[PDB]
């Protein structure tokens, strides 16, 4: 018995390099693999090339990167090890990559010209030459202009424009863009068309807390800041009224409306707890929890010459300063094997909360502190139980009260083994923030009976990133070693997060082949791969002046094309929505993961699919077949 095993992503992409991971288990000496991808069903041979040999020098582990040219489409992969031939049918995706759109402003007047770029990139964020359709939809959803343009030799950037007619529908327009080949996968930005003129100053309202506690009787205390777009503080008078939102329904609290002076660019206002309740007056205070608050400020300069409106919205009403989230924690535990929880503690608005202690039910010591990204990791132990695990984490912030702590409950089901072999694998890694350049220790924990532990001489680990296989290797292991550690090096290639999945295999129960696997998702500190700073290149000195020449310094990646744009900060007083941001990008990129679970699965076959991989062996062990284009829900 040699077992041959074949691994590739759940979903394969066209016109891009995918990797096939070839293995020979319990085999002797050289073995030739020829790998092949045909159409489905039938025979076309969409790619023949890629041939290689596994050597005991490489413990029988191999790459081979192939590229597939170019109802739902499927290919058939088929690798031949010597004579024995393994084949799996994988789902295919026409999605070339991503599109990102940039508008010079967020808001425009009729009869001005919208300037917009479109960035064309593959599923690994690199620039690409393709054909794209673009569409300017009016605010009632009507396509009112379309250019079909190709970004070949464009170097990833498609500058465009469109003049708004003097006569046109006010409101939120959209720019929808899609790849010729992937018309179902569409991309959008919005922009406001409106009649207006840039104000001369900006107005800022922040509550002293980013939320309201329904028993805080001081009320909701607000600061109103005003300041001309050029620095200097504003002198004037201000009108602020409040209101309640739930959920798209707004109710003003007229009794709340106050007129206050703005002196040295600041005024202060409050919505007394009284007036809030007398205002909505649902039977009890606790009714308001889960609803949001808004402050609407209107500021008039003393000249009367300029005026400005402004709003902070969605201040949540809460019984607690925090929220707990198991969205980063695997929902499958390995009986007898520690169960690690990534507790994610946020503030009421959504930001990560930092330095927040959390503990399990009772606990009764335990406890660990939330890190920068609002993640802390608690580990409990599991028994030989198959019953569902129901853990409950409460926050243990001092200075609070049992009332004010947040809570949450979650449930994991056990990983089922091959005929109850009570063999398992458990990956653990340290929860701290991860930057590229650092190195990460990935703890391989193993659970099985000493009668069989010695057969496990190695683990296979695959790194998943942006839905492609990024790195795969072997982590060795000497009999008796329960814990081994693979010191993984984190490069920029890992941003903005990666899954590590690993598996050992052996013959066991009754001469039965057994694949045992685990996985885990790890978050890299989001940032640019390269870099881009725009600073003053006017070494020294003081303010520049209307009309004057000014020198700019651009620091970024070699041979990179840089595209600028400059906007009057007054434009942003009027609309700050829909701005382009490296973050908005990575977020797109994560929401395109072919991986669905935070780690682990129901059985070995799950661990793989959930992390985004397919597994197939000469013995017949393998993942279910993925035929759905997205994750389930």
């Amino acid at each position: 018995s040699p077992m041959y095993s074949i691994i590739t992503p759940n979903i394969l992409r066209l016109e891009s390099e995918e990797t096939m991971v070839l293995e020979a288990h319990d085999a002797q000496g050289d073995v030739p693999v020829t790998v092949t991808v045909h159409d489905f069903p039938g025979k076309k041979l969409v790619l023949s090339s890629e041939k290689t040999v596994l050597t005991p020098a490489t413990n029988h582990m191999g790459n081979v990167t192939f590229t597939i040219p170019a109802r739902n489409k499927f290919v058939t992969v088929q690798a031949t090890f010597g004579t024995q031939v393994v084949e799996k049918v994988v789902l295919v995706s026409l999605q070339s990559g991503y599109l990102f759109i940039q508008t010079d402003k967020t808001i425009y007047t009729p009869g001005s010209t919208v300037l917009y770029r479109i960035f064309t990139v593959n599923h690994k964020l690199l620039p690409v030459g393709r054909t794209v359709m673009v569409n300017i939809e009016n605010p009632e959803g009507i396509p009112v202009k379309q250019d079909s343009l190709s970004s070949q030799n464009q170097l990833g950037v498609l500058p465009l424009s469109w003049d708004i007619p003097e006569l046109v529908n006010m409101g939120q327009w959209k720019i929808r863009a899609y790849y010729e080949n992937s018309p179902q996968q569409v991309f959008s930005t919005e922009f406001e068309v409106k009649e207006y003129v840039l104000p001369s100053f900006e107005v800022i309202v922040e509550p002293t807390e980013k939320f309201y506690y329904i028993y805080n009787e001081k009320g909701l205390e607000v600061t109103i800041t005003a300041r001309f777009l050029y620095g200097k503080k504003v002198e004037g008078t201000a009108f602020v009224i409040f209101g309640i939102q739930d959920g798209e329904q707004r109710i003003s609290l007229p009794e709340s409306l106050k007129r206050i002076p703005i002196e040295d660019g600041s005024g202060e206002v409050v919505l007394s707890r009284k007036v809030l309740l007398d205002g909505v007056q649902n039977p009890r205070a606790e009714d308001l929890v889960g609803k949001s608050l808004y402050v609407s400020a209107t500021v008039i300069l003393h000249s009367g010459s300029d005026m400005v409106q402004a709003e902070r919205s969605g201040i949540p009403i809460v019984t607690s300063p925090y929220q707990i989230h198991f969205t980063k924690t695997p929902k499958y535990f390995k009986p007898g094997m520690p169960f690690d929880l990534m507790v994610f503690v946020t503030n009421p608005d959504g930001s990560p909360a930092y330095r927040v202690p959390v503990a399990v039910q009772g606990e009764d010591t335990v406890q660990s502190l939330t890190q920068g990204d609002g993640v802390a990791k608690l580990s409990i132990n599991t028994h030989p139980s198959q019953k569902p695990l129901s853990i409950t984490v409460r926050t243990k912030k001092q200075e609070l009260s049992e009332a004010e702590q947040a809570t949450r409950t979650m449930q994991a089901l056990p990983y089922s083994t091959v005929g109850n072999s009570n063999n398992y694998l458990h990956l653990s890694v340290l929860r701290t923030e991860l930057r590229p350049g650092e190195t990460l220790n990935v703890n391989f924990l193993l659970r099985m009976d000493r009668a069989h532990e010695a057969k496990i001489r190695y683990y296979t680990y695959l790194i998943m990133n942006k839905g492609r296989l990024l790195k795969a290797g072997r982590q060795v292991r000497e009999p008796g070693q329960d814990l081994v550690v693979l010191p993984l090096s984190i490069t920029t290639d890992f941003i903005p997060s990666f899954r590590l999945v690993a598996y050992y295999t052996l013959i066991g129960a009754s001469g039965q082949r057994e694949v045992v696997a685990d996985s885990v998702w790890v978050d890299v500190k989001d940032s640019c791969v390269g870099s881009l700073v725009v600073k003053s290149g006017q070494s020294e000195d003081r303010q520049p002046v209307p009309g004057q020449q000014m020198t700019l310094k651009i620091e970024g990646d070699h041979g990179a094309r840089v595209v600028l744009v400059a906007v009057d900060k007054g434009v942003f007083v009027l609309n700050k929505k829909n701005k382009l941001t490296q973050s908005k990008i990575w977020d797109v990129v994560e929401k395109a993961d072919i991986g669905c679970t935070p780690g682990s699965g129901k059985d070995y076959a799950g661990v793989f699919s959930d992390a985004g991989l397919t597994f197939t062996s000469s013995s017949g062990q393998q993942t279910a077949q993925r035929a759905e284009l997205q994750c389930p829900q």
């Binding site: 004037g236 008078t237 209107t298 000249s303 009367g304």
Partner: protein, 296 residues
Amino acid sequence: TCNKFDLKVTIKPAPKNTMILEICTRYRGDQDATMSILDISMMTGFAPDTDDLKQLANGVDRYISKYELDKAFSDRNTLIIYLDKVSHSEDDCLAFKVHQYFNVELIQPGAVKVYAYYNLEESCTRFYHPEKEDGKLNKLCRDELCRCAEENCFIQKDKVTLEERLDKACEPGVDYVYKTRLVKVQLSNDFDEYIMAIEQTIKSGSDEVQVGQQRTFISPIKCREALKLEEKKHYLMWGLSSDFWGEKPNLSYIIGKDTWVEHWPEEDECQDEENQKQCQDLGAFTESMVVFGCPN
């Protein structure tokens, strides 16, 4: 149009210069309005009677930031009265006095503007002036078109010599000089209309008008006291090409800030020993223009 707030602004003198600025902006709705405001501006040179400000300052539903109430004459040409609420039944009225310190001629109409804080759109602007109708300056609007008529009027009624005439009348802008008869006179609400026959064409620019053709001149009614043009008498005048109104050769002319006015005594009037001097100057002007033309 003042859709949501009926607004009336009144300027009458007082019982250095000083006067009474009043107002009243009713709300065109079914209830009273939310705190509302007036962006008040002043006829050039005036500043509020600081005292009269405080009578307004402590009032019920009345406030002026201790910021403005304090500037005084100094340079307080803007101020905002915050009327807590507003009426829709009759009209919240109030008034106060302004003293245009440092008397200076040719003043500007004040523009009082009101709005409900939460809405700059539903506002309004009504003007005022010691001598102008409801604050609107003087314009001349004939249909879709228009122009300005708030200057001084006809050319200045220090001596009026003969070298002086031959000058002006040869500066660039000047496109015509005629001896004329005032044929008929039609007056109407906006513009009078003096139709005149051209008796001799001294200088001749763009207008290909012959002598006797007869062309038509206009004027704002606020330009009759000082013109006293009289049918059947003769006249010498000239004007700029920028006073042409219309499209050939039903252009009328405009008597304007740069148009010359002069009454040409009849032929037997040239005898009075008080008339001759103007009867010889002009003949000694006609004669130069027709012979020599213009220098440049």
